[PDB]
Every structure is written in structure tokens, then in C-alpha cells.
Design a protein around this motif. Structure first.
Motif, PDB file in Angstrom:
ATOM      1  N   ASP A 159       0.829  -1.204   0.000  1.00 32.30           N
ATOM      2  CA  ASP A 159       0.000   0.000   0.000  1.00 32.30           C
ATOM      3  C   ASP A 159       0.863   1.253   0.000  1.00 32.30           C
ATOM      4  O   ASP A 159       0.620   2.194  -0.769  1.00 32.30           O
ATOM      5  CB  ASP A 159      -0.923   0.011   1.216  1.00 32.30           C
ATOM      6  N   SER A 160       1.878   1.287   0.862  1.00 31.10           N
ATOM      7  CA  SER A 160       2.691   2.491   1.004  1.00 31.10           C
ATOM      8  C   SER A 160       3.545   2.734  -0.229  1.00 31.10           C
ATOM      9  O   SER A 160       3.575   3.847  -0.767  1.00 31.10           O
ATOM     10  CB  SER A 160       3.565   2.383   2.253  1.00 31.10           C
TER      11      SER A 160
ATOM     12  N   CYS B 122       3.097   1.604  -3.250  1.00 30.35           N
ATOM     13  CA  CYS B 122       2.303   1.872  -4.445  1.00 30.35           C
ATOM     14  C   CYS B 122       1.705   3.271  -4.427  1.00 30.35           C
ATOM     15  O   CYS B 122       1.536   3.877  -5.492  1.00 30.35           O
ATOM     16  CB  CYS B 122       1.204   0.823  -4.613  1.00 30.35           C
ATOM     17  N   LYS B 123       1.382   3.808  -3.249  1.00 28.04           N
ATOM     18  CA  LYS B 123       0.942   5.201  -3.201  1.00 28.04           C
ATOM     19  C   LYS B 123       2.028   6.131  -3.729  1.00 28.04           C
ATOM     20  O   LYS B 123       1.736   7.092  -4.449  1.00 28.04           O
ATOM     21  CB  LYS B 123       0.536   5.584  -1.777  1.00 28.04           C
TER      22      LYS B 123
ATOM     23  N   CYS C 207       2.524   5.647  -7.647  1.00 31.73           N
ATOM     24  CA  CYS C 207       1.405   6.118  -8.450  1.00 31.73           C
ATOM     25  C   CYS C 207       1.071   7.584  -8.211  1.00 31.73           C
ATOM     26  O   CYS C 207       0.062   8.076  -8.735  1.00 31.73           O
ATOM     27  CB  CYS C 207       0.177   5.245  -8.173  1.00 31.73           C
ATOM     28  N   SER C 208       1.903   8.302  -7.452  1.00 31.64           N
ATOM     29  CA  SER C 208       1.566   9.653  -7.015  1.00 31.64           C
ATOM     30  C   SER C 208       1.603  10.677  -8.135  1.00 31.64           C
ATOM     31  O   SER C 208       1.235  11.832  -7.899  1.00 31.64           O
ATOM     32  CB  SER C 208       2.515  10.095  -5.905  1.00 31.64           C
TER      33      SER C 208
ATOM     34  N   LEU D  87      -2.796   2.301  -8.968  1.00 29.55           N
ATOM     35  CA  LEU D  87      -2.787   1.729  -7.626  1.00 29.55           C
ATOM     36  C   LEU D  87      -3.232   0.277  -7.646  1.00 29.55           C
ATOM     37  O   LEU D  87      -2.716  -0.547  -6.880  1.00 29.55           O
ATOM     38  CB  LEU D  87      -3.686   2.542  -6.696  1.00 29.55           C
TER      39      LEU D  87
END
Length: 63
Positions: free
Chosen positions: A6-7, A9-10, A13-14, A23
Motif C-alpha cells: 500500500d505504502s 504503491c501510493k 502512483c503519485s 494503484l
């Protein structure tokens, strides 16, 4: 947090034009490969599994 997929990929994909799709696919690839490349594009040599994952038409799957 408590999930590196999760972290990471955030971050990955930012700066994506299709953030939700990024995401999703980054998530899938991290679930499979347990690795996400740094930055928001490129650097896929950091994660050979992520780099090489293909979809059913033989296209790169992981953003």
C-alpha cells in the motif's frame, strides 16, 4: 502504516494520469512480487519480478 505494498504503491502512483488503475496494478504486482520500484516511472531493474510481469496479451502489467 503497516503494509509496504500500500505504502510503496501510493508513492509509485503519485504522479499517474490514471491513479486508481495504477494503484490497482501496482497492488497486484506487489502482491505477486513483494517489490515496487522507486520513483514514479522507470527503475524497474530494482524489481525483476515487477519488471517482467506480463498480462495475457504479453504486455507489461506493472506501472
Amino acid at each position: 502504516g503497516s503494509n509496504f505494498c500500500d505504502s510503496k504503491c501510493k508513492l509509485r502512483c503519485s504522479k499517474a494520469g490514471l491513479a486508481d488503475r495504477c494503484l490497482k496494478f501496482c497492488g497486484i504486482c506487489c502482491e505477486e512480487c513483494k517489490c515496487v520500484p522507486s520513483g514514479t516511472y522507470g527503475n524497474k531493474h530494482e524489481c525483476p519480478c515487477y519488471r517482467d510481469k506480463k498480462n495475457s496479451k504479453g504486455k507489461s502489467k506493472c506501472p
